Amino acid sequence: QDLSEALKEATKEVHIRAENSEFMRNFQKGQVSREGFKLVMASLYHIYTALEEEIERNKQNPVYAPLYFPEELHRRAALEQDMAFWYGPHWQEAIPYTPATQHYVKRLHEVGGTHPELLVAHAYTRYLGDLSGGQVLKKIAQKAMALPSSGEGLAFFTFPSIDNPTKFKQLYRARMNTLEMTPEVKHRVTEEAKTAFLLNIELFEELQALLT
């Protein structure tokens, strides 16, 4: 079984639970205000920063290298732009760093520093999601909060270096299947992906609690 197939199958159930979490539900209903949106985007800033720091650390490692696409996928730069938009010039010392976000970042550094062979699970969970649900969320965000088609405030959801997301995802899945795979690694990579989804679910549950 190809890694891409194993991952889709391993996370199809938890994905249903994630996309139907209370926070995503309210978001899809346009009931989230500037406050909630700023909270989640700030959390993603911390998460992608940690993820990409670990990707850079392991870019030359064959257990990840084939998936090294900073120009097309990395979000830190976009998030820095979005943070400046929503939080202003001094966003640096203004954005929050919630416990659930810290927990996610912690696991990211553990994976990147001690179990790099599992980093693909985290890149897969974040980036493939961004190229999917993230695109529908972008349109919902624009409508609900009156964000211009121009893109300001939604740089995170914009991939200027990717012409066709559907096509890129197919290329990304194919490349995922070229990584050195053993029953051992495939087993743990799919487990870490489920873990990644859970960390996301926990972040959302925490943010929803903080907002209500």
Q: Which residues bind ligand HEM (CB under 6 A)?
A: 7-8, 15, 18-19, 24, 124-126, 128-129, 132-133, 136-137, 169, 197, 200
| Termini Cα distance of the chain | 44
Alpha helix segments (H runs only) across 20-132? 22-28, 34-57, 70-73, 76-87, 99-114, 119-123, 129-130
Nearest approach in angstroms of CB 40 to ligand [Xe] is 5
d(CA 18, CA 22): 9
Question: With breaks defined as C to next N over 2.5 Å, after which residues does the chain break?
Answer: none
Question: Between 34-57 and 133-145, two packed helices, what is the crossing angle to 10 degrees?
Answer: 150
Nearer to ligand [Xe] by Cβ, of 54 and 82: the residue is 82
Return the one option of ligand [Xe], ligand HEM, none that residue 125 interacts with (CB less than 5 to 8 A, by type): ligand HEM
Q: How far is the CB of 141 from ligand HEM (least distance, A)?
A: 11
Does 124 appear as a known binding residue? yes
> What are the residues binding ligand [Xe] (CB under 6 A)?
40, 137
CB of 137 to ligand [Xe], least distance (A): 6
Annotated binding site for heme b: 8, 15, 124, 173
